[PDB]
Structure 1
Amino acid sequence: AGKKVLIVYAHQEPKSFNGSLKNVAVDELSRQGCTVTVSDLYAMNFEPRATDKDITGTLSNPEVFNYGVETHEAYKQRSLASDITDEQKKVREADLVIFQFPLYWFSVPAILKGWMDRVLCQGFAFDIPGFYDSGLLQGKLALLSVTTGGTAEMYTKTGVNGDSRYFLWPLQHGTLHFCGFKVLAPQISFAPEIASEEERKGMVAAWSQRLQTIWKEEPIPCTAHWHFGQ
């Protein structure tokens, strides 16, 4: 009772399959009585580039620009750009962060990569200490809901693309785990464009139905063994 969800959504088209997955997430979580917020990156024209614009006022060292340093200091000094801080407030308040995106080059689209780069700064998402199991967003759940062009068969250990778990590593382990998230099993909706309409509805319904019991879920063991082992 009282769970808060942030959906970070990265697709250009409301009528897309990604749009539909985001919308049933909103519908079903709202129905449950959850607090729901959506960051529609393309609609926000979210800035992906890590630049000195991300620090307002006076730079900690305006002769040699070091993004990591400058943003760490700016966070501690409440001097980050407001597009970034707006996102951090949403994340701070959320118990669950769902990312909804089409797979671009075995990864997130650049606009969402930019969100990760700029929003998850040191002092906010991680520090020394406080990473992996002890990262600063510990307590929070994160979940990747990804759509692919490639079929499930292509994403097997012997398929052309390798196991889908292989490309999850930088996202689930290198990013989410690192910051302290417990990582819920990814939702992977394989090749909607190729699948039939029965199959497509089946995937949307799978997602809607999964959302019904999302708060009862055990998070994966976010390990090398999980991603690459047998």
Structure 2
Amino acid sequence: MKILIVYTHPNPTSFNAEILKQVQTNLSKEHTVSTLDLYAEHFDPVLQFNETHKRRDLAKVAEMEKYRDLVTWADHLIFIFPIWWSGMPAILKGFIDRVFVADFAYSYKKVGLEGHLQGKSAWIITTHNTPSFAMPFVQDYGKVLKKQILKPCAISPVKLTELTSIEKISDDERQKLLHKVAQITRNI
């Protein structure tokens, strides 16, 4: 299938960068793969609208066309990012804000939303330093992207993989998680 990896981290030698490598090298050669590196793209995540350029025409904003096309093209999206303040780094938040717009990713129904991205699945891989025993007691941490962004847009299924206590654990332990990620990737 057609695979889009949306990767979010400022540092090319980060652990996230390593996670990206595991995914890229382990995806079968039968898939066609594009990597979207938001930091490398110098992506501008600030959504602009007003009376001059109306919110209604956001799906037609030129600067965002490339990204709309990458999303439409894809069958499966893989998101890689660290948890910053319980959620997506700002550049990735604004990727959603700006690219997942009405009349593209969804449209408004009599009540609620009608998702337009049917036929697509996703995988979320996220790192954070919070212990797993604590996770039922915390808000978001990837649950927003999965349950309240991707799902309402008709993207299903959405697998969520959290790698927890990521800075407390050891290099050994981290490398076991990378191996887990590599194997999940092969099993797609």
With structure 1 as the length reference, what TM-score do the two structures score? 0.75
Residue in structure 2 matched with residue 140 of structure 1 by the alignment: 120
Q: Which amino acid aligns with 2:46?
A: R
- Alignment deviations for residues 44-69 of structure 1 (CA, whole Å, 9 cap, x no partner): 110010114xxxxxx8x42xx643x2
1:143 Cα deviation from its structure 2 partner = 1.7
Residue in structure 2 matched with residue 183 of structure 1 by the alignment: 157
Instruction: Summarize the alignment of residues 129-208 of structure 1 with structure 2, pairs less than 5 Å apart.
Output: 129=109, 135-155=115-135, 157=136, 162=137, 166-208=140-182
Q: Is the 8 A contact 2:105 2:117 kept in 1?
A: yes
- Of 104, 120, 124, the match for 2:84: 104
Cα RMSD (Å): 2.3
1:211 Cα deviation from its structure 2 partner = 1.1
- Of 75, 87, 98, the match for 2:67: 87
Q: Is the 8 A contact 2:126 2:142 kept in 1?
A: no
Q: Is the 8 A contact 1:124 1:136 kept in 2?
A: yes
Residue in structure 1 matched with residue 57 of structure 2 by the alignment: 70
Indicate yes or no: 2:31 matched with 1:42: no
Higher relative contact order (CA 8 A, sep 6+): 2
In 2, Cα distance between the equivalents of 1:123 and 1:92? Answer: 13
Residue in structure 2 matched with residue 113 of structure 1 by the alignment: 93
- Alignment deviations for residues 90-137 of structure 1 (CA, whole Å, 9 cap, x no partner): 111111001100001111000000000000111110013499895110
Residue in structure 2 matched with residue 127 of structure 1 by the alignment: 107
* 5+ residue gaps, structure 2: none
More strand by share: 2
* 5+ residue gaps, structure 1: 53-58, 215-230
Residue in structure 1 matched with residue 24 of structure 2 by the alignment: 26
In 1, Cα distance between the equivalents of 2:153 and 2:110? Answer: 8
Residue in structure 1 matched with residue 12 of structure 2 by the alignment: 14
Flag the structure with larger Rg: 1
Q: Is the 8 A contact 1:96 1:141 kept in 2?
A: yes
Q: Is the 8 A contact 1:138 1:180 kept in 2?
A: yes
Corresponding pairs, count: 188
1:198 Cα deviation from its structure 2 partner = 1.5
Query: The residue matched to 2:150 in structure 1 has which SS?
Result: helix
